[PDB]
Amino acid sequence: SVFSERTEESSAVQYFQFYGYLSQQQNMMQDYVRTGTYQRAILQNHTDFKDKIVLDVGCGSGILSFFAAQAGARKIYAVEASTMAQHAEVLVKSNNLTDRIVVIPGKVEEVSLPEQVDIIISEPMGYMLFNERMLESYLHAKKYLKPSGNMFPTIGDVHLAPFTDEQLYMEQFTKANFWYQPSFHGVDLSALRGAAVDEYFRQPVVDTFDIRILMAKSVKYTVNFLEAKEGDLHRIEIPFKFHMLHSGLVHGLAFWFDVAFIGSIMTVWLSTAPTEPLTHWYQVRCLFQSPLFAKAGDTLSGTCLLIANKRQSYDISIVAQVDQTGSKSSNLLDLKNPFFRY
Amino acid sequence: RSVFSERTEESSAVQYFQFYGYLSQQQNMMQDYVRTGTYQRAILQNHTDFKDKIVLDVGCGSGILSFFAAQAGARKIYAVEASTMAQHAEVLVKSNNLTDRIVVIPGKVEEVSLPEQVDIIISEPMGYMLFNERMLESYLHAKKYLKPSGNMFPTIGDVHLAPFTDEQLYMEQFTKANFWYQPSFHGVDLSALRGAAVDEYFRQPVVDTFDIRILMAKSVKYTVNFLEAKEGDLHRIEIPFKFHMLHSGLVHGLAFWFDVAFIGSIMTVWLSTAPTEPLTHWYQVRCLFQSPLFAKAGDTLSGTCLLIANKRQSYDISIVAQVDQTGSKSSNLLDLKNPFFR
Amino acid sequence: RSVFSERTEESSAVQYFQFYGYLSQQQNMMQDYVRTGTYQRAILQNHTDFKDKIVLDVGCGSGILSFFAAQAGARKIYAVEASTMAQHAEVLVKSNNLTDRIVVIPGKVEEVSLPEQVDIIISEPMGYMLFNERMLESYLHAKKYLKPSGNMFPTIGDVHLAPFTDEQLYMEQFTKANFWYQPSFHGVDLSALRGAAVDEYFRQPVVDTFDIRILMAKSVKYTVNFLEAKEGDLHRIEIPFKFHMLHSGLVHGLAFWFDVAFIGSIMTVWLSTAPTEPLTHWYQVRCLFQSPLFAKAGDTLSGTCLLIANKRQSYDISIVAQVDQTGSKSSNLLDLKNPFFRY
Amino acid sequence: SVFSERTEESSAVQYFQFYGYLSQQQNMMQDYVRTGTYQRAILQNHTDFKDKIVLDVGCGSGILSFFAAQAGARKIYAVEASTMAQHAEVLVKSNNLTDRIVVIPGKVEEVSLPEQVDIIISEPMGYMLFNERMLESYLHAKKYLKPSGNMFPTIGDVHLAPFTDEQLYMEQFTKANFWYQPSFHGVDLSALRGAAVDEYFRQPVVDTFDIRILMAKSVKYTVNFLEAKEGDLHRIEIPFKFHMLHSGLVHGLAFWFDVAFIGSIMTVWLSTAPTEPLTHWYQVRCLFQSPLFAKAGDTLSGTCLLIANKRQSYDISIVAQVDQTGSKSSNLLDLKNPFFRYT
Numbered sequence A: 001s002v003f004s005e006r007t008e009e010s011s012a013v014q015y016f017q018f019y020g021y022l023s024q025q026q027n028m029m030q031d032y033v034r035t036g037t038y039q040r041a042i043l044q045n046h047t048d049f050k051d052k053i054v055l056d057v058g059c060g061s062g063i064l065s066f067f068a069a070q071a072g073a074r075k076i077y078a079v080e081a082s083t084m085a086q087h088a089e090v091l092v093k094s095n096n097l098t099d100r101i102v103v104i105p106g107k108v109e110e111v112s113l114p115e116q117v118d119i120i121i122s123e124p125m126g127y128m129l130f131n132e133r134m135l136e137s138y139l140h141a142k143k144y145l146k147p148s149g150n151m152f153p154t155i156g157d158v159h160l161a162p163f164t165d166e167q168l169y170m171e172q173f174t175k176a177n178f179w180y181q182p183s184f185h186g187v188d189l190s191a192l193r194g195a196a197v198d199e200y201f202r203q204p205v206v207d208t209f210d211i212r213i214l215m216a217k218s219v220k221y222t223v224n225f226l227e228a229k230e231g232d233l234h235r236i237e238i239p240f241k242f243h244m245l246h247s248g249l250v251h252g253l254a255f256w257f258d259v260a261f262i263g264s265i266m267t268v269w270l271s272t273a274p275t276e277p278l279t280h281w282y283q284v285r286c287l288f289q290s291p292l293f294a295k296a297g298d299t300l301s302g303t304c305l306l307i308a309n310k311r312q313s314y315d316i317s318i319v320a321q322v323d324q325t326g327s328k329s330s331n332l333l334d335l336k337n338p339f340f341r342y
Numbered sequence B: 001r002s003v004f005s006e007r008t009e010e011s012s013a014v015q016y017f018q019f020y021g022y023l024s025q026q027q028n029m030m031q032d033y034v035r036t037g038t039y040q041r042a043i044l045q046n047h048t049d050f051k052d053k054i055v056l057d058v059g060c061g062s063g064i065l066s067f068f069a070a071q072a073g074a075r076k077i078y079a080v081e082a083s084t085m086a087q088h089a090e091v092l093v094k095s096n097n098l099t100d101r102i103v104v105i106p107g108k109v110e111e112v113s114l115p116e117q118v119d120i121i122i123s124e125p126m127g128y129m130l131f132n133e134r135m136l137e138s139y140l141h142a143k144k145y146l147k148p149s150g151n152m153f154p155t156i157g158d159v160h161l162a163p164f165t166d167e168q169l170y171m172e173q174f175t176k177a178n179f180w181y182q183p184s185f186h187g188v189d190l191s192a193l194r195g196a197a198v199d200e201y202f203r204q205p206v207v208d209t210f211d212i213r214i215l216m217a218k219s220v221k222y223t224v225n226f227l228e229a230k231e232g233d234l235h236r237i238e239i240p241f242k243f244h245m246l247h248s249g250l251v252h253g254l255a256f257w258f259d260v261a262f263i264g265s266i267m268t269v270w271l272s273t274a275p276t277e278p279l280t281h282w283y284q285v286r287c288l289f290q291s292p293l294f295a296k297a298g299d300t301l302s303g304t305c306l307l308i309a310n311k312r313q314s315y316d317i318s319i320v321a322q323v324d325q326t327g328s329k330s331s332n333l334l335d336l337k338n339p340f341f342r
Numbered sequence C: 001r002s003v004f005s006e007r008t009e010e011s012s013a014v015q016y017f018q019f020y021g022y023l024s025q026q027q028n029m030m031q032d033y034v035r036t037g038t039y040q041r042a043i044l045q046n047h048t049d050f051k052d053k054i055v056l057d058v059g060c061g062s063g064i065l066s067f068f069a070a071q072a073g074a075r076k077i078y079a080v081e082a083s084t085m086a087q088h089a090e091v092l093v094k095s096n097n098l099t100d101r102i103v104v105i106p107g108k109v110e111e112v113s114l115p116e117q118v119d120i121i122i123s124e125p126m127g128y129m130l131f132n133e134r135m136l137e138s139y140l141h142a143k144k145y146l147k148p149s150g151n152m153f154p155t156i157g158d159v160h161l162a163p164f165t166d167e168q169l170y171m172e173q174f175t176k177a178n179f180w181y182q183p184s185f186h187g188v189d190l191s192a193l194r195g196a197a198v199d200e201y202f203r204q205p206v207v208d209t210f211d212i213r214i215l216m217a218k219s220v221k222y223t224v225n226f227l228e229a230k231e232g233d234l235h236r237i238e239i240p241f242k243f244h245m246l247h248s249g250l251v252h253g254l255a256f257w258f259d260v261a262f263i264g265s266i267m268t269v270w271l272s273t274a275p276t277e278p279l280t281h282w283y284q285v286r287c288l289f290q291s292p293l294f295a296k297a298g299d300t301l302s303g304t305c306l307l308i309a310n311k312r313q314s315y316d317i318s319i320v321a322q323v324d325q326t327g328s329k330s331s332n333l334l335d336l337k338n339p340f341f342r343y
Numbered sequence D: 001s002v003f004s005e006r007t008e009e010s011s012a013v014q015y016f017q018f019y020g021y022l023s024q025q026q027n028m029m030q031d032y033v034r035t036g037t038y039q040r041a042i043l044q045n046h047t048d049f050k051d052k053i054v055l056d057v058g059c060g061s062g063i064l065s066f067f068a069a070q071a072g073a074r075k076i077y078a079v080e081a082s083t084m085a086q087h088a089e090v091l092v093k094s095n096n097l098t099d100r101i102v103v104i105p106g107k108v109e110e111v112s113l114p115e116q117v118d119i120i121i122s123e124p125m126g127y128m129l130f131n132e133r134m135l136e137s138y139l140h141a142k143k144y145l146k147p148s149g150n151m152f153p154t155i156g157d158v159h160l161a162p163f164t165d166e167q168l169y170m171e172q173f174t175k176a177n178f179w180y181q182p183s184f185h186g187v188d189l190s191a192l193r194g195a196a197v198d199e200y201f202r203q204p205v206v207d208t209f210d211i212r213i214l215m216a217k218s219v220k221y222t223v224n225f226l227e228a229k230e231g232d233l234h235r236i237e238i239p240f241k242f243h244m245l246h247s248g249l250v251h252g253l254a255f256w257f258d259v260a261f262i263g264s265i266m267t268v269w270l271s272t273a274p275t276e277p278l279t280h281w282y283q284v285r286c287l288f289q290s291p292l293f294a295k296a297g298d299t300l301s302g303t304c305l306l307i308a309n310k311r312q313s314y315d316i317s318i319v320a321q322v323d324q325t326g327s328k329s330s331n332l333l334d335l336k337n338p339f340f341r342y343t
């Protein structure tokens, strides 16, 4: 299958084992912003669901399928690959919706669905929007979508902005310098200090932060899920030119994302921005190997290149330059193994 | 086909050795001064057991125990390590000018070849609750390389079990599970899954420390003699217990910790993770009952802790305990692989 | 075949009036100084409403309110009381030399025969949550004796309710029910009764006081006008509510208190059992949801509190609450007759 | 029936409503001395149960029936008059014992049993042993007992002893002196002081105490359940001669009880004495209206007469005199309404 060809078995096993836990479902459900916004987008756009056929991709415990039922869908196909599909079935039964919701256990790339649907709903977003590569499964499912169908979410915007955080930058070295001693219990560890530094720097930092560390308005990269093909997510080249609003040292790029549900009655936004209430997605920061000085009014130009890998994630390649000075830096990070700093 | 691969799912092995490839993890273990300081003391205080001897270090990591063996005068130390850390260990060997005494052998101890038999084996095979990671079997397996009258550091492992009271912890885990009692979460009835939730939430061993005054009886000791034990002895571990209750009250579960002894020629050195001792990175482990038991002082609490090794490098744990005088009985199942760090 | 006996189980009445035959209970009520002092202020500051008037004291107990009416100048006071406390009332009337003004008439106000119509009715008909004991219906029934131009003290009653958060209270009640989850209590599996236990423990309204900071919205007010209301109006009491949540968090239930006003000719005197006021022997009352509701500040919490009168001189309470934006809904049935005294 | 003939309906309705609560079952079950001693008595005398027919009188949630089953009984008829019988039935089913335990809802004086039984088990003891008058129901059940039959408990011993407790005595007047004031909000209450005193003294005091307040070795009155008849419990006369071990003022009599399960293997005792761990029965004290001075070596003689009433309890009459001085005191108390003093 398309899933198998693009995913290492070892990664897939652990991934779906992780989502087999009710505790992870509770963590997602207890995010009020997430759950409430999904509910609001579906119910306030009830004409997009009433008497429609719906496909729910990666339904987990089934919550979005229930919301689609509340809005009056005629039939909902709920697809889930983890063992959570068992529990979703229990809820479908216990909520007396077996006549309207059918749970299909398996990967959406592999299951057989009988008919074309009117709308696909899903929560495919990971860290930095793209982590887990579930957006590809979501787009792959469009093989079941009628030509005039819709997607909830309809678009996703990843946002990038330069930040200054001297303490975050220094912290890497404080930790790595553990290795810089000539006699740790009689052992000279200093030869590994460089390796330790590199290792810390390859890890995106998952946590939140004061918006006052941001030095420029974000750059936006938009994926239109109604137009995109799944192949469009294998390589994501995000050019940027930031107009510096503040003068200082730039230590890296901060990432967050929004998605929009564009229905017939209204458009509803779900944002993970640092200006908004915190979510279980937090935000993500990637450090440069060296900070860049930029005056207010300078331009910081470069690219963020995301290269998908077989571990259901991305390698992040970042290059940045201060145009007015020519000062340049970069980093290459592994999104599969972020550092949870929060 | 090897002993390791036959008892281990590839998926589990991949993530396991990936985890131990990280220098940040080596640092976390090394910075446990109780652990590191006690190992050095055990080896240097028993320098005669190493002086001009051939040594095997099982799962050497960055090699710190090999370096202790070298300080103690070992003629030759074979340092076996299956993760990519083995290459970092070789870098330290070279930078400490010990190429003449420490020889890194990359790979699994169940699969590599050694040129000769050794006089003593050293390792840190202890995981959480002693047995997690199933490294003790690799440790015992390496005895195929041990000369008939060879030694092992550590020489023995003591598992301690004792009943505890902690209503706060118990209701902490009950509060989490009650989420799945909701009859209308955003209009959805979750109550059918309440049973599954409690089961899942109570399968988690609780990792943290506690005040010794929560213990309700003197501990029971289960000893593993690593000189005598065979690998197969650890596939199914049945630990009987009979506690003489010292205080009346609710027993919410069993607390676990372990000691290991290094029985050398000069002296015996103990490494303890007991709640009476300085805290280590192993902390202590508590297994909750789904329903507490009441016992009065002078009563006896009897039963079995059953550990079945699984193919995920861990154990499925079965605890059954009853108050002998009343027949009040509790029985819980735990997944040692996935604890709750508190 | 009186109105009282028609709406009341004999077993309930016997115990009810036996309870109120105890002097120790009269002492408890009288020693509530907010209560006794406010009643005296309402009556004496409005003395013109009593001076040379005919008074009916409904459920007079030891007679304290009748003595206040006599202090205010009442020409004649009929003090009706159905418990054996009527006899102690008579003793106090004689020892206080008020035999020419206070006339104890033993019996139920629904069954006695009064010699004439009265200018004003006085009583303390309020139980826990205001409505417990169904004494308000006896109070209203007594209006058959009230002149058209007549007054009632208290004149109106305001029920207040507001959502609260209190995880510790919620946890206390579940810790109690956890007992019936045991799969082997002395070798017996109890767990089949765990549902029944939770229902029973959460049926208990909680009587005690609390910090006003646990309240998550402005209270809603339900007003009963005693001059206007009819007995039949209290058989089914439906209180709709819509709260504008001022704080985010889990709502564990609704808190209840009441105010009564004495609307006299000279001034209105208020007696409040609100948690912002000095504690009374009424305290405050909290009804727990079996499952808490989450709401954010700005959301609205709407639903109904429905009280259905029963033949044990109390009400069967049903509360349904729903977060309007999410449809998160919770309900509970409470037995007002038998509260949990937590104080 | 025999039950309805000796019990007022109003009392019976409240009584069985009370025992309908799972919270009350939980309360009794959590008394470990109580629950544990019954289990011990039954299990350690397994030969009185193994393959036998059993009747459990007032089984409540059914716990004693399950112990009889654990001891190997062939068949247990469990009789319970409250709605708790519905919960017992649930437990029998969920515990897979429907083949061995038959729940029979109803009063034991009114149900029919299909066969005679080898042994009757019950927990009929109330405060001061006799409160609730369930011992009569227990004795009544002997119409179903075979001539060899045994009874668990087999005998009941009521103990009584004189005590001194100056502070408990003075407490009564401290409370009653509320009424001794000439202007409570303008009202002279003093005429009711005597009635208030009398009311406090008619209440037996339920709590525990230090054994050092006892002034003499207890006197024991024994009910043998194998021999006693129902009628024997309608009038209980307990004579006493106390030989005073200490000099001081005697403020009343203290009561507690033991029961023995006299089985074929051994006799097990359940005691509520102040020398033993506390139970939910506590101990009971009945004050004298006036204390009696006795010297060490003096004799305190008199009678404790218990007279059954139709409220499922007893009127208590105690008369005592000091033989060497002729000094005399008495009291009349109402066991149905004790003062719970324990803190």
Ligand SMILES: NC(=[NH2+])NC/C=C/[C@H]1O[C@@H](n2cnc3c(N)ncnc32)[C@H](O)[C@@H]1O
Pocket (backbone or CB within 6 Å): A003, A016, A019, A057, A058, A059, A060, A079, A080, A081, A082, A084, A106, A107, A108, A109, A123, A124, A125, A126, A132, A134, A137
């Ligand atoms: N936080 C998040 N929302 N993370 C992403 C959400 C992942 C959810 O979707 C499921 N899922 C992921 N890929 C799938 C596929 N190919 N077919 C079917 N179900 C799939 C996961 O098991 C989980 O329940």
Ligand SMILES: NC(=[NH2+])NC/C=C/[C@H]1O[C@@H](n2cnc3c(N)ncnc32)[C@H](O)[C@@H]1O
Pocket (backbone or CB within 6 Å): B004, B017, B020, B058, B059, B060, B061, B080, B081, B082, B083, B085, B107, B108, B109, B110, B124, B125, B126, B127, B133, B135, B138
């Ligand atoms: N807390 C701890 N001390 N945990 C255990 C420590 C295990 C260490 O030994 C290595 N290891 C585990 N199993 C092995 C095997 N079969 N052959 C070779 N190396 C192995 C791990 O990669 C890690 O460095």
Ligand SMILES: NC(=[NH2+])NC/C=C/[C@H]1O[C@@H](n2cnc3c(N)ncnc32)[C@H](O)[C@@H]1O
Pocket (backbone or CB within 6 Å): C004, C017, C020, C029, C058, C059, C060, C061, C080, C081, C082, C083, C085, C107, C108, C109, C110, C124, C125, C126, C127, C133, C135, C138
């Ligand atoms: N705490 C309180 N204020 N409780 C309410 C007040 C109850 C008082 O009024 C009496 N009472 C109740 N219903 C009555 C009726 N139908 N006729 C005559 N007297 C009656 C009670 O015996 C008690 O003295």
Ligand SMILES: NC(=[NH2+])NC/C=C/[C@H]1O[C@@H](n2cnc3c(N)ncnc32)[C@H](O)[C@@H]1O
Pocket (backbone or CB within 6 Å): D003, D016, D019, D028, D057, D058, D059, D060, D079, D080, D081, D082, D084, D106, D107, D108, D109, D123, D124, D125, D126, D132, D134, D137
């Ligand atoms: N703490 C205690 N041991 N209290 C006494 C125990 C009383 C128990 O016996 C029941 N009971 C009382 N009289 C009964 C009768 N005549 N027939 C059947 N069941 C009856 C009560 O409902 C309660 O469950």
